[model samples]
Target: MISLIAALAVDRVIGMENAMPWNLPADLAWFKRNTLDKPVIMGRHTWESIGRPLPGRKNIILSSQPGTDDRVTWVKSVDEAIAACGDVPEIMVIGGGRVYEQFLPKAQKLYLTHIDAEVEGDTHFPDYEPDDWESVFSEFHDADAQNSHSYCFEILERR
Candidate 1:
Protein backbone atom coordinates (compact mmCIF):
# COMPACT_ATOMS: atom_id res chain seq x y z
CA MET A 1 0.00 0.00 0.00
CA ILE A 2 1.01 3.62 -0.39
CA SER A 3 1.72 5.96 2.50
CA LEU A 4 2.71 9.61 2.85
CA ILE A 5 5.07 11.13 5.38
CA ALA A 6 5.79 14.83 5.83
CA ALA A 7 5.99 17.83 8.11
CA LEU A 8 4.16 21.05 7.33
CA ALA A 9 3.20 24.26 9.06
CA VAL A 10 -0.18 25.77 10.04
CA ASP A 11 -0.34 27.40 6.63
CA ARG A 12 0.10 23.96 5.08
CA VAL A 13 3.57 25.16 4.16
CA ILE A 14 6.15 22.51 3.55
CA GLY A 15 9.23 24.09 2.02
CA MET A 16 10.62 27.51 1.48
CA GLU A 17 13.32 28.07 -1.17
CA ASN A 18 13.30 24.33 -1.99
CA ALA A 19 14.31 23.02 1.44
CA MET A 20 12.70 22.06 4.73
CA PRO A 21 12.71 25.14 6.90
CA TRP A 22 12.83 23.54 10.34
CA ASN A 23 15.42 21.12 11.60
CA LEU A 24 14.03 18.42 13.84
CA PRO A 25 16.81 15.94 14.47
CA ALA A 26 14.53 13.44 16.14
CA ASP A 27 12.00 13.54 13.35
CA LEU A 28 14.69 12.98 10.72
CA ALA A 29 16.02 10.05 12.71
CA TRP A 30 12.54 8.58 12.72
CA PHE A 31 12.33 9.07 8.96
CA LYS A 32 15.60 7.24 8.35
CA ARG A 33 14.71 4.36 10.60
CA ASN A 34 11.35 3.84 8.94
CA THR A 35 12.35 4.50 5.33
CA LEU A 36 15.50 2.39 5.47
CA ASP A 37 15.34 -0.87 3.54
CA LYS A 38 12.11 0.29 1.89
CA PRO A 39 11.29 1.98 -1.39
CA VAL A 40 10.59 5.72 -1.30
CA ILE A 41 8.69 7.49 -4.09
CA MET A 42 9.25 11.16 -4.79
CA GLY A 43 9.30 13.62 -7.65
CA ARG A 44 12.31 15.14 -9.39
CA HIS A 45 12.37 18.25 -7.24
CA THR A 46 12.35 16.33 -3.97
CA TRP A 47 15.12 14.08 -5.20
CA GLU A 48 17.09 17.10 -6.37
CA SER A 49 16.83 18.77 -2.97
CA ILE A 50 18.22 15.72 -1.20
CA GLY A 51 20.95 15.74 -3.88
CA ARG A 52 21.64 12.00 -3.64
CA PRO A 53 19.92 8.72 -3.08
CA LEU A 54 19.64 8.05 0.61
CA PRO A 55 21.71 5.07 1.69
CA GLY A 56 19.99 1.68 2.29
CA ARG A 57 16.77 2.62 0.48
CA LYS A 58 15.92 2.49 -3.19
CA ASN A 59 14.60 5.81 -4.43
CA ILE A 60 11.91 5.83 -7.12
CA ILE A 61 11.27 9.14 -8.83
CA LEU A 62 8.15 10.15 -10.76
CA SER A 63 8.58 12.54 -13.64
CA SER A 64 6.89 13.47 -16.86
CA GLN A 65 10.14 12.84 -18.70
CA PRO A 66 13.04 10.47 -18.03
CA GLY A 67 16.52 11.66 -17.18
CA THR A 68 20.01 10.38 -16.33
CA ASP A 69 19.66 9.56 -12.64
CA ASP A 70 20.37 5.81 -12.48
CA ARG A 71 19.72 5.70 -8.76
CA VAL A 72 16.16 6.83 -9.48
CA THR A 73 13.69 4.79 -11.48
CA TRP A 74 11.62 7.27 -13.40
CA VAL A 75 7.95 6.43 -13.71
CA LYS A 76 5.20 8.40 -15.45
CA SER A 77 2.25 7.33 -13.33
CA VAL A 78 1.43 6.40 -9.74
CA ASP A 79 0.24 2.97 -10.79
CA GLU A 80 3.57 2.32 -12.45
CA ALA A 81 5.42 3.20 -9.29
CA ILE A 82 3.12 0.88 -7.31
CA ALA A 83 3.78 -1.87 -9.80
CA ALA A 84 7.50 -1.36 -9.47
CA CYS A 85 7.22 -1.70 -5.73
CA GLY A 86 5.75 -5.17 -6.29
CA ASP A 87 4.64 -7.01 -3.14
CA VAL A 88 6.37 -4.73 -0.70
CA PRO A 89 4.09 -4.08 2.26
CA GLU A 90 4.68 -0.35 2.08
CA ILE A 91 5.76 2.27 -0.40
CA MET A 92 6.40 5.77 0.86
CA VAL A 93 5.22 8.86 -1.03
CA ILE A 94 7.83 11.34 0.03
CA GLY A 95 7.07 14.66 -1.54
CA GLY A 96 7.06 18.14 -2.92
CA GLY A 97 3.55 19.67 -3.32
CA ARG A 98 2.63 18.20 -6.69
CA VAL A 99 3.67 14.68 -5.80
CA TYR A 100 1.67 14.84 -2.60
CA GLU A 101 -1.45 16.06 -4.39
CA GLN A 102 -1.18 13.36 -7.02
CA PHE A 103 -0.95 10.51 -4.49
CA LEU A 104 -2.83 11.79 -1.46
CA PRO A 105 -6.15 10.32 -2.59
CA LYS A 106 -4.64 6.86 -2.82
CA ALA A 107 -2.62 6.97 0.37
CA GLN A 108 -3.58 4.46 3.04
CA LYS A 109 -1.99 6.32 5.87
CA LEU A 110 -0.26 9.60 6.51
CA TYR A 111 2.54 10.44 8.93
CA LEU A 112 2.20 14.15 9.36
CA THR A 113 4.08 16.69 11.39
CA HIS A 114 1.86 19.70 12.09
CA ILE A 115 4.14 22.55 13.01
CA ASP A 116 2.92 25.16 15.47
CA ALA A 117 4.07 28.11 13.44
CA GLU A 118 3.03 30.12 10.43
CA VAL A 119 5.13 30.36 7.30
CA GLU A 120 5.34 32.62 4.29
CA GLY A 121 5.49 30.54 1.15
CA ASP A 122 4.10 30.47 -2.37
CA THR A 123 3.00 26.83 -2.05
CA HIS A 124 0.90 24.86 0.41
CA PHE A 125 -0.82 21.54 0.96
CA PRO A 126 -4.43 21.14 -0.18
CA ASP A 127 -7.20 21.85 2.27
CA TYR A 128 -9.13 18.74 3.19
CA GLU A 129 -12.01 18.78 5.61
CA PRO A 130 -11.50 16.98 8.91
CA ASP A 131 -14.17 14.50 7.87
CA ASP A 132 -11.99 13.36 5.02
CA TRP A 133 -9.59 11.43 7.24
CA GLU A 134 -9.55 9.46 10.42
CA SER A 135 -6.95 10.27 13.01
CA VAL A 136 -5.28 7.15 14.22
CA PHE A 137 -3.01 8.95 16.66
CA SER A 138 -1.52 12.32 17.44
CA GLU A 139 0.93 13.75 19.96
CA PHE A 140 2.06 17.30 20.57
CA HIS A 141 5.68 18.32 20.88
CA ASP A 142 6.20 21.63 22.57
CA ALA A 143 9.17 23.89 22.01
CA ASP A 144 11.75 22.76 24.46
CA ALA A 145 14.56 24.80 25.94
CA GLN A 146 16.47 23.50 22.94
CA ASN A 147 14.57 23.38 19.66
CA SER A 148 12.77 26.49 18.54
CA HIS A 149 9.99 24.77 16.61
CA SER A 150 6.95 23.20 18.20
CA TYR A 151 4.85 20.65 16.38
CA CYS A 152 2.46 17.74 16.63
CA PHE A 153 2.85 14.35 15.03
CA GLU A 154 -0.31 12.84 13.58
CA ILE A 155 -1.03 9.50 12.03
CA LEU A 156 -4.08 9.60 9.81
CA GLU A 157 -5.91 6.94 7.92
CA ARG A 158 -8.37 7.20 5.06
CA ARG A 159 -11.91 7.60 6.30
Candidate 2:
Protein backbone atom coordinates (compact mmCIF):
# COMPACT_ATOMS: atom_id res chain seq x y z
CA MET A 1 0.00 0.00 0.00
CA ILE A 2 1.18 3.52 -0.72
CA SER A 3 0.19 6.60 1.29
CA LEU A 4 0.66 10.14 0.03
CA ILE A 5 1.42 12.75 2.67
CA ALA A 6 1.57 16.51 2.45
CA ALA A 7 0.74 19.84 4.06
CA LEU A 8 -1.01 22.24 1.73
CA ALA A 9 -2.45 25.70 2.06
CA VAL A 10 -6.13 26.37 1.38
CA ASP A 11 -5.39 27.03 -2.28
CA ARG A 12 -3.48 23.72 -2.53
CA VAL A 13 -0.10 25.44 -2.57
CA ILE A 14 2.54 23.27 -0.98
CA GLY A 15 5.88 24.95 -1.56
CA MET A 16 7.49 28.29 -2.05
CA GLU A 17 10.97 28.52 -3.58
CA ASN A 18 11.45 24.78 -3.17
CA ALA A 19 10.64 24.95 0.55
CA MET A 20 7.60 24.93 2.72
CA PRO A 21 5.93 28.34 2.89
CA TRP A 22 5.32 28.10 6.61
CA ASN A 23 6.98 26.62 9.68
CA LEU A 24 4.28 24.67 11.44
CA PRO A 25 5.77 22.52 14.14
CA ALA A 26 2.55 20.61 14.70
CA ASP A 27 2.40 19.61 11.04
CA LEU A 28 6.02 18.55 11.03
CA ALA A 29 5.39 16.43 14.10
CA TRP A 30 2.35 14.93 12.41
CA PHE A 31 4.49 13.98 9.40
CA LYS A 32 7.11 12.28 11.53
CA ARG A 33 4.51 10.36 13.48
CA ASN A 34 3.04 8.69 10.40
CA THR A 35 6.10 8.31 8.17
CA LEU A 36 8.43 6.86 10.79
CA ASP A 37 9.62 3.32 10.09
CA LYS A 38 8.04 3.42 6.63
CA PRO A 39 9.78 3.53 3.29
CA VAL A 40 9.28 7.03 1.89
CA ILE A 41 9.51 7.53 -1.87
CA MET A 42 10.46 10.90 -3.30
CA GLY A 43 12.09 12.53 -6.30
CA ARG A 44 15.67 13.73 -6.54
CA HIS A 45 14.64 17.34 -6.07
CA THR A 46 12.61 16.44 -3.02
CA TRP A 47 15.64 14.69 -1.50
CA GLU A 48 17.79 17.71 -2.28
CA SER A 49 15.23 19.99 -0.69
CA ILE A 50 15.33 17.80 2.40
CA GLY A 51 19.20 17.99 2.28
CA ARG A 52 19.68 14.54 3.83
CA PRO A 53 18.07 11.18 4.20
CA LEU A 54 15.54 11.33 7.01
CA PRO A 55 16.38 9.19 10.01
CA GLY A 56 14.10 6.38 11.29
CA ARG A 57 12.72 5.82 7.78
CA LYS A 58 13.98 4.35 4.55
CA ASN A 59 14.55 7.12 2.02
CA ILE A 60 13.96 6.03 -1.56
CA ILE A 61 14.64 8.52 -4.32
CA LEU A 62 13.42 8.24 -7.89
CA SER A 63 16.41 8.70 -10.16
CA SER A 64 18.13 7.36 -13.24
CA GLN A 65 21.16 6.17 -11.36
CA PRO A 66 20.62 3.37 -8.93
CA GLY A 67 23.05 3.86 -6.08
CA THR A 68 23.23 3.78 -2.31
CA ASP A 69 24.41 6.54 -0.05
CA ASP A 70 24.21 6.29 3.70
CA ARG A 71 20.51 5.57 4.33
CA VAL A 72 19.36 6.52 0.83
CA THR A 73 18.32 4.21 -1.97
CA TRP A 74 18.11 5.52 -5.53
CA VAL A 75 15.41 3.86 -7.59
CA LYS A 76 14.80 4.12 -11.28
CA SER A 77 11.02 4.12 -11.07
CA VAL A 78 7.96 3.99 -8.82
CA ASP A 79 7.52 0.29 -9.40
CA GLU A 80 11.08 -0.35 -8.36
CA ALA A 81 10.62 1.57 -5.15
CA ILE A 82 7.41 -0.27 -4.36
CA ALA A 83 9.13 -3.56 -5.12
CA ALA A 84 11.94 -2.54 -2.77
CA CYS A 85 9.48 -2.19 0.04
CA GLY A 86 8.74 -5.92 -0.27
CA ASP A 87 6.36 -7.06 2.46
CA VAL A 88 6.15 -3.75 4.22
CA PRO A 89 2.50 -2.97 4.80
CA GLU A 90 2.74 0.64 3.74
CA ILE A 91 5.02 2.92 1.79
CA MET A 92 4.80 6.72 1.91
CA VAL A 93 5.20 9.05 -1.03
CA ILE A 94 6.54 12.23 0.54
CA GLY A 95 7.34 14.60 -2.24
CA GLY A 96 7.76 17.61 -4.43
CA GLY A 97 5.01 17.99 -7.13
CA ARG A 98 6.16 15.50 -9.75
CA VAL A 99 6.57 12.57 -7.40
CA TYR A 100 3.21 13.17 -5.79
CA GLU A 101 1.53 13.35 -9.18
CA GLN A 102 3.21 10.13 -10.22
CA PHE A 103 1.85 8.24 -7.24
CA LEU A 104 -1.50 9.92 -6.80
CA PRO A 105 -3.44 7.40 -8.84
CA LYS A 106 -1.85 4.51 -7.00
CA ALA A 107 -2.17 5.93 -3.54
CA GLN A 108 -4.41 3.94 -1.26
CA LYS A 109 -4.32 6.50 1.51
CA LEU A 110 -3.70 10.22 1.89
CA TYR A 111 -2.59 12.01 5.03
CA LEU A 112 -3.02 15.70 4.52
CA THR A 113 -2.66 18.73 6.76
CA HIS A 114 -5.01 21.38 5.47
CA ILE A 115 -3.63 24.79 6.35
CA ASP A 116 -6.11 27.62 6.79
CA ALA A 117 -4.46 30.29 4.67
CA GLU A 118 -3.64 30.68 1.02
CA VAL A 119 0.00 31.12 0.01
CA GLU A 120 2.06 31.94 -3.04
CA GLY A 121 4.06 28.93 -4.16
CA ASP A 122 5.71 27.23 -7.11
CA THR A 123 4.52 23.80 -6.14
CA HIS A 124 1.02 22.54 -5.54
CA PHE A 125 -0.62 19.29 -4.55
CA PRO A 126 -2.21 17.26 -7.34
CA ASP A 127 -5.94 17.74 -7.77
CA TYR A 128 -8.32 14.84 -7.36
CA GLU A 129 -12.02 14.27 -7.71
CA PRO A 130 -13.92 14.12 -4.43
CA ASP A 131 -15.90 11.13 -5.67
CA ASP A 132 -12.74 9.10 -6.06
CA TRP A 133 -11.90 9.07 -2.38
CA GLU A 134 -13.60 9.09 0.99
CA SER A 135 -12.45 10.75 4.14
CA VAL A 136 -11.80 8.10 6.75
CA PHE A 137 -10.59 10.37 9.52
CA SER A 138 -10.31 14.06 10.31
CA GLU A 139 -9.11 16.04 13.31
CA PHE A 140 -8.92 19.81 13.71
CA HIS A 141 -6.18 21.69 15.55
CA ASP A 142 -6.53 25.35 16.42
CA ALA A 143 -3.50 27.52 15.80
CA ASP A 144 -1.68 28.81 18.84
CA ALA A 145 1.00 31.50 19.03
CA GLN A 146 3.55 28.90 18.11
CA ASN A 147 1.54 27.38 15.28
CA SER A 148 0.87 30.00 12.66
CA HIS A 149 -2.36 28.68 11.15
CA SER A 150 -5.17 26.49 12.36
CA TYR A 151 -5.24 23.20 10.43
CA CYS A 152 -6.91 19.86 10.12
CA PHE A 153 -5.32 16.49 9.71
CA GLU A 154 -7.31 14.37 7.30
CA ILE A 155 -6.95 10.80 6.14
CA LEU A 156 -8.66 9.87 2.89
CA GLU A 157 -8.89 6.42 1.42
CA ARG A 158 -9.53 5.50 -2.20
CA ARG A 159 -13.12 4.37 -2.62
Candidate 3:
Protein backbone atom coordinates (compact mmCIF):
# COMPACT_ATOMS: atom_id res chain seq x y z
CA MET A 1 0.00 0.00 0.00
CA ILE A 2 0.99 3.61 -0.47
CA SER A 3 0.71 6.32 2.15
CA LEU A 4 1.02 10.09 1.84
CA ILE A 5 2.15 11.81 5.01
CA ALA A 6 2.53 15.54 5.70
CA ALA A 7 1.96 18.34 8.15
CA LEU A 8 -0.44 21.10 7.07
CA ALA A 9 -2.10 24.21 8.41
CA VAL A 10 -5.80 24.98 8.88
CA ASP A 11 -5.67 27.47 6.01
CA ARG A 12 -4.26 24.71 3.82
CA VAL A 13 -0.87 26.40 3.84
CA ILE A 14 1.93 23.89 3.40
CA GLY A 15 5.19 25.71 2.72
CA MET A 16 6.76 29.08 2.25
CA GLU A 17 9.72 29.40 -0.13
CA ASN A 18 9.88 25.58 -0.08
CA ALA A 19 10.21 25.20 3.67
CA MET A 20 7.96 24.37 6.54
CA PRO A 21 7.67 27.37 8.84
CA TRP A 22 7.22 25.46 12.06
CA ASN A 23 9.57 22.88 13.50
CA LEU A 24 7.78 20.23 15.47
CA PRO A 25 10.42 17.95 16.92
CA ALA A 26 7.79 15.43 18.00
CA ASP A 27 6.34 15.20 14.53
CA LEU A 28 9.73 14.76 12.89
CA ALA A 29 10.66 12.05 15.38
CA TRP A 30 7.38 10.25 14.75
CA PHE A 31 7.96 10.41 10.98
CA LYS A 32 11.49 9.08 11.29
CA ARG A 33 10.47 6.17 13.51
CA ASN A 34 7.59 5.12 11.30
CA THR A 35 9.43 5.38 7.96
CA LEU A 36 12.82 4.04 8.94
CA ASP A 37 14.12 1.11 6.85
CA LYS A 38 11.47 1.85 4.25
CA PRO A 39 11.39 3.49 0.85
CA VAL A 40 10.03 7.03 0.67
CA ILE A 41 9.01 8.78 -2.55
CA MET A 42 9.16 12.55 -2.88
CA GLY A 43 9.47 15.31 -5.46
CA ARG A 44 12.85 16.57 -6.56
CA HIS A 45 12.30 19.89 -4.88
CA THR A 46 11.45 18.17 -1.63
CA TRP A 47 14.75 16.35 -1.68
CA GLU A 48 16.55 19.53 -2.60
CA SER A 49 14.90 21.44 0.21
CA ILE A 50 16.18 18.81 2.62
CA GLY A 51 19.66 19.57 1.18
CA ARG A 52 20.55 15.90 1.20
CA PRO A 53 19.11 12.47 1.74
CA LEU A 54 17.87 11.42 5.14
CA PRO A 55 19.67 8.61 6.92
CA GLY A 56 18.23 5.21 7.93
CA ARG A 57 15.55 5.29 5.23
CA LYS A 58 15.61 4.73 1.50
CA ASN A 59 15.34 8.27 0.15
CA ILE A 60 13.44 7.84 -3.09
CA ILE A 61 13.16 11.06 -5.07
CA LEU A 62 10.56 11.33 -7.83
CA SER A 63 11.37 13.35 -10.90
CA SER A 64 10.28 13.40 -14.51
CA GLN A 65 13.90 13.87 -15.39
CA PRO A 66 16.40 11.04 -15.51
CA GLY A 67 19.50 10.81 -13.33
CA THR A 68 20.72 9.03 -10.19
CA ASP A 69 21.49 9.76 -6.57
CA ASP A 70 22.63 6.87 -4.32
CA ARG A 71 19.95 7.77 -1.81
CA VAL A 72 17.40 8.46 -4.54
CA THR A 73 15.24 6.20 -6.66
CA TRP A 74 14.29 8.37 -9.64
CA VAL A 75 10.97 7.89 -11.36
CA LYS A 76 9.02 9.51 -14.17
CA SER A 77 5.68 9.08 -12.53
CA VAL A 78 3.81 8.01 -9.40
CA ASP A 79 3.30 4.61 -11.03
CA GLU A 80 7.04 4.16 -11.07
CA ALA A 81 7.28 5.02 -7.39
CA ILE A 82 4.69 2.33 -6.65
CA ALA A 83 6.57 -0.15 -8.79
CA ALA A 84 9.95 0.54 -7.20
CA CYS A 85 8.63 0.14 -3.69
CA GLY A 86 7.99 -3.54 -4.61
CA ASP A 87 6.35 -5.78 -2.01
CA VAL A 88 6.85 -3.51 0.95
CA PRO A 89 3.75 -3.52 3.13
CA GLU A 90 3.67 0.25 2.92
CA ILE A 91 5.60 2.96 1.13
CA MET A 92 5.65 6.62 2.08
CA VAL A 93 4.88 9.49 -0.32
CA ILE A 94 6.58 12.38 1.42
CA GLY A 95 6.36 15.68 -0.35
CA GLY A 96 6.24 19.27 -1.52
CA GLY A 97 2.79 20.58 -2.58
CA ARG A 98 2.83 19.30 -6.15
CA VAL A 99 3.80 15.78 -5.14
CA TYR A 100 0.98 15.62 -2.61
CA GLU A 101 -1.60 16.55 -5.24
CA GLN A 102 -0.32 13.99 -7.69
CA PHE A 103 -0.33 11.15 -5.17
CA LEU A 104 -3.30 11.87 -2.95
CA PRO A 105 -5.79 10.00 -5.11
CA LYS A 106 -3.37 7.11 -5.46
CA ALA A 107 -2.84 6.87 -1.71
CA GLN A 108 -4.50 4.21 0.40
CA LYS A 109 -3.98 6.10 3.60
CA LEU A 110 -2.95 9.51 4.88
CA TYR A 111 -0.91 10.33 7.95
CA LEU A 112 -1.41 14.00 8.57
CA THR A 113 -0.23 16.42 11.21
CA HIS A 114 -3.02 18.96 11.32
CA ILE A 115 -1.82 22.22 12.75
CA ASP A 116 -4.49 24.53 14.13
CA ALA A 117 -2.79 27.74 13.08
CA GLU A 118 -1.95 29.33 9.76
CA VAL A 119 1.32 30.65 8.40
CA GLU A 120 2.60 32.52 5.36
CA GLY A 121 3.07 29.82 2.75
CA ASP A 122 3.32 29.68 -0.99
CA THR A 123 2.26 26.02 -1.15
CA HIS A 124 -0.87 24.40 0.18
CA PHE A 125 -2.18 20.95 0.94
CA PRO A 126 -5.44 19.84 -0.69
CA ASP A 127 -8.61 20.09 1.31
CA TYR A 128 -9.70 16.88 3.00
CA GLU A 129 -13.39 16.48 3.61
CA PRO A 130 -14.89 14.03 6.09
CA ASP A 131 -16.89 12.53 3.27
CA ASP A 132 -13.70 11.66 1.48
CA TRP A 133 -11.96 9.63 4.16
CA GLU A 134 -12.56 7.67 7.33
CA SER A 135 -10.61 8.66 10.38
CA VAL A 136 -9.31 5.35 11.63
CA PHE A 137 -7.02 6.82 14.24
CA SER A 138 -6.46 10.26 15.70
CA GLU A 139 -5.05 11.96 18.77
CA PHE A 140 -5.52 15.63 19.56
CA HIS A 141 -2.43 17.01 21.23
CA ASP A 142 -2.91 19.55 23.92
CA ALA A 143 -1.62 22.96 22.80
CA ASP A 144 -0.46 23.60 26.36
CA ALA A 145 1.13 20.22 27.04
CA GLN A 146 2.95 19.76 23.78
CA ASN A 147 2.91 23.43 24.62
CA SER A 148 5.14 24.52 21.77
CA HIS A 149 2.42 24.04 19.12
CA SER A 150 -1.18 22.87 18.82
CA TYR A 151 -1.87 20.06 16.42
CA CYS A 152 -3.47 16.66 15.98
CA PHE A 153 -1.91 13.62 14.43
CA GLU A 154 -4.44 11.89 12.21
CA ILE A 155 -4.49 8.56 10.45
CA LEU A 156 -7.18 8.32 7.84
CA GLU A 157 -8.17 5.56 5.46
CA ARG A 158 -9.99 5.93 2.19
CA ARG A 159 -13.66 5.12 2.47
Candidate 4:
Protein backbone atom coordinates (compact mmCIF):
# COMPACT_ATOMS: atom_id res chain seq x y z
CA MET A 1 0.00 0.00 0.00
CA ILE A 2 1.08 3.58 -0.58
CA SER A 3 0.48 6.34 1.95
CA LEU A 4 1.22 10.07 1.70
CA ILE A 5 2.18 12.30 4.61
CA ALA A 6 1.97 16.11 4.41
CA ALA A 7 1.33 19.15 6.54
CA LEU A 8 -0.54 21.90 4.74
CA ALA A 9 -2.30 25.03 5.87
CA VAL A 10 -6.00 25.85 5.49
CA ASP A 11 -5.18 27.55 2.19
CA ARG A 12 -3.51 24.34 0.97
CA VAL A 13 -0.08 25.98 1.12
CA ILE A 14 2.77 23.51 1.56
CA GLY A 15 6.09 25.25 0.97
CA MET A 16 7.60 28.67 0.97
CA GLU A 17 10.82 28.60 -1.04
CA ASN A 18 11.22 24.86 -0.32
CA ALA A 19 10.58 25.10 3.41
CA MET A 20 7.39 24.60 5.35
CA PRO A 21 5.54 27.83 6.02
CA TRP A 22 4.76 27.03 9.62
CA ASN A 23 6.38 25.25 12.53
CA LEU A 24 4.52 22.62 14.48
CA PRO A 25 6.45 20.18 16.63
CA ALA A 26 3.33 18.11 17.28
CA ASP A 27 3.06 17.43 13.55
CA LEU A 28 6.71 16.44 13.44
CA ALA A 29 6.22 13.95 16.28
CA TRP A 30 3.14 12.55 14.57
CA PHE A 31 5.08 12.18 11.31
CA LYS A 32 7.92 10.30 13.02
CA ARG A 33 5.63 7.91 14.84
CA ASN A 34 3.78 6.96 11.67
CA THR A 35 6.75 6.83 9.28
CA LEU A 36 9.29 5.03 11.45
CA ASP A 37 10.54 1.80 9.85
CA LYS A 38 8.51 2.44 6.70
CA PRO A 39 10.18 2.82 3.33
CA VAL A 40 9.84 6.48 2.30
CA ILE A 41 9.77 7.85 -1.26
CA MET A 42 10.49 11.52 -1.93
CA GLY A 43 11.51 13.84 -4.75
CA ARG A 44 15.13 14.89 -5.08
CA HIS A 45 14.43 18.45 -3.98
CA THR A 46 12.62 17.15 -0.93
CA TRP A 47 15.61 15.04 0.02
CA GLU A 48 17.97 17.91 -0.67
CA SER A 49 16.01 20.23 1.59
CA ILE A 50 16.32 17.73 4.41
CA GLY A 51 19.99 17.24 3.37
CA ARG A 52 20.34 13.78 4.88
CA PRO A 53 18.67 10.40 4.91
CA LEU A 54 16.08 9.75 7.56
CA PRO A 55 17.19 7.15 10.07
CA GLY A 56 15.23 3.86 10.34
CA ARG A 57 13.48 4.39 6.97
CA LYS A 58 14.78 3.46 3.56
CA ASN A 59 15.02 6.58 1.43
CA ILE A 60 13.93 6.22 -2.20
CA ILE A 61 14.58 9.38 -4.12
CA LEU A 62 13.16 10.31 -7.52
CA SER A 63 15.48 12.56 -9.43
CA SER A 64 16.19 13.51 -13.02
CA GLN A 65 19.83 12.55 -12.71
CA PRO A 66 20.86 9.38 -10.96
CA GLY A 67 23.23 9.78 -8.03
CA THR A 68 25.03 7.54 -5.59
CA ASP A 69 24.47 7.74 -1.87
CA ASP A 70 25.26 5.00 0.61
CA ARG A 71 22.28 5.96 2.70
CA VAL A 72 19.78 6.31 -0.17
CA THR A 73 18.57 4.79 -3.43
CA TRP A 74 18.15 7.25 -6.28
CA VAL A 75 15.66 6.46 -9.03
CA LYS A 76 14.69 8.47 -12.09
CA SER A 77 10.99 7.77 -12.07
CA VAL A 78 8.08 7.13 -9.73
CA ASP A 79 7.73 3.56 -10.96
CA GLU A 80 11.40 3.02 -10.27
CA ALA A 81 11.13 4.45 -6.78
CA ILE A 82 8.13 2.29 -5.98
CA ALA A 83 10.01 -0.72 -7.28
CA ALA A 84 12.89 0.15 -4.97
CA CYS A 85 10.55 0.03 -2.00
CA GLY A 86 9.78 -3.62 -2.88
CA ASP A 87 6.81 -5.27 -1.20
CA VAL A 88 6.52 -3.22 1.93
CA PRO A 89 3.24 -3.35 3.88
CA GLU A 90 2.84 0.38 3.47
CA ILE A 91 5.32 2.71 1.79
CA MET A 92 5.21 6.35 2.77
CA VAL A 93 5.38 9.06 0.08
CA ILE A 94 6.98 12.07 1.67
CA GLY A 95 7.14 14.92 -0.77
CA GLY A 96 7.79 18.17 -2.45
CA GLY A 97 4.66 19.22 -4.44
CA ARG A 98 5.67 17.42 -7.60
CA VAL A 99 6.13 14.09 -5.88
CA TYR A 100 2.75 14.35 -4.15
CA GLU A 101 1.08 15.30 -7.43
CA GLN A 102 2.34 12.16 -9.12
CA PHE A 103 1.65 9.74 -6.26
CA LEU A 104 -1.69 11.06 -5.04
CA PRO A 105 -3.57 9.05 -7.61
CA LYS A 106 -1.70 5.86 -6.73
CA ALA A 107 -1.86 6.42 -2.98
CA GLN A 108 -4.36 4.37 -0.98
CA LYS A 109 -4.10 6.38 2.21
CA LEU A 110 -3.31 9.95 3.22
CA TYR A 111 -1.88 11.27 6.46
CA LEU A 112 -2.60 15.00 6.39
CA THR A 113 -2.19 17.74 8.96
CA HIS A 114 -4.41 20.72 8.24
CA ILE A 115 -3.20 23.87 9.91
CA ASP A 116 -5.65 26.52 11.05
CA ALA A 117 -3.69 29.59 10.01
CA GLU A 118 -3.35 30.92 6.48
CA VAL A 119 0.11 31.43 5.02
CA GLU A 120 1.72 32.25 1.71
CA GLY A 121 3.76 29.67 -0.12
CA ASP A 122 5.15 29.00 -3.57
CA THR A 123 4.24 25.32 -3.42
CA HIS A 124 0.95 23.62 -2.70
CA PHE A 125 -0.45 20.12 -2.40
CA PRO A 126 -2.43 18.76 -5.32
CA ASP A 127 -6.17 18.69 -5.24
CA TYR A 128 -7.77 15.47 -3.98
CA GLU A 129 -11.30 14.21 -3.87
CA PRO A 130 -12.79 14.26 -0.39
CA ASP A 131 -15.72 12.12 -1.54
CA ASP A 132 -13.43 9.28 -2.50
CA TRP A 133 -11.83 9.11 0.93
CA GLU A 134 -13.07 8.61 4.48
CA SER A 135 -11.38 9.86 7.58
CA VAL A 136 -10.47 6.97 9.86
CA PHE A 137 -8.43 8.94 12.36
CA SER A 138 -8.68 12.54 13.45
CA GLU A 139 -7.00 14.53 16.20
CA PHE A 140 -7.06 18.27 16.70
CA HIS A 141 -4.38 20.05 18.68
CA ASP A 142 -4.21 23.65 19.75
CA ALA A 143 -1.10 25.78 19.31
CA ASP A 144 1.32 25.63 22.24
CA ALA A 145 4.83 26.83 23.00
CA GLN A 146 6.56 24.22 20.88
CA ASN A 147 3.89 24.01 18.21
CA SER A 148 3.30 27.39 16.64
CA HIS A 149 0.09 26.64 14.80
CA SER A 150 -3.15 24.86 15.65
CA TYR A 151 -3.32 21.72 13.57
CA CYS A 152 -5.42 18.67 12.96
CA PHE A 153 -3.92 15.27 12.30
CA GLU A 154 -6.13 13.31 9.95
CA ILE A 155 -5.74 9.88 8.39
CA LEU A 156 -7.88 9.22 5.37
CA GLU A 157 -8.25 5.87 3.72
CA ARG A 158 -9.72 5.46 0.27
CA ARG A 159 -13.37 4.58 0.37
RMSD of each: 1.7, 1.6, 2.1, 1.2
Model 2 clash tally, residue pairs: 0
Task: For candidate 1, give the lDDT of residue 127.
Answer: 62
How many angstroms is residue 64 displaced in model 3 relative to the true structure, after the best TM-score fit? 2.5
The lDDT of each candidate is 0.81, 0.87, 0.81, 0.88
Higher-ranked by TM-score: 1 or 3 = 1
- Candidate 3, 6-122: lDDT as tens digits: 988868787787466665777887788878888888898888887777887777778878855765678888787788888988889888889999888877899988887778888
Per-residue accuracy of model 4 over 1-159 as CA lDDT, tens digit each: 999999888678887775665678888889899999999998878888889989998988888986857678889988888899888899999888999999999989999999997877888899988999999999998998888889899999998
- Highest lDDT against the true fold, candidate: 4
lDDT of 1: 0.81
lDDT of 1 by residue, 68-149 (tens): 6776688888888888887898888888889889888888888888887777876677666678789999898887765568
Q: What would the TM-score be for candidate 3 when compared with the true structure?
A: 0.88
Q: Pick the winner on lDDT between candidates 1 and 4.
A: 4
lDDT of 2 by residue, 1-159 (tens): 889999889788887775665668999899999999999898887888888878999888898875657568888987898998879899899987899998998989899999998778888899988798899999998989889889999999999
Which stretches in model 3 have alpha-carbon errors above 4 Å? Answer: 143-147
What is the lDDT ranking, best to worst? 4, 2, 1, 3
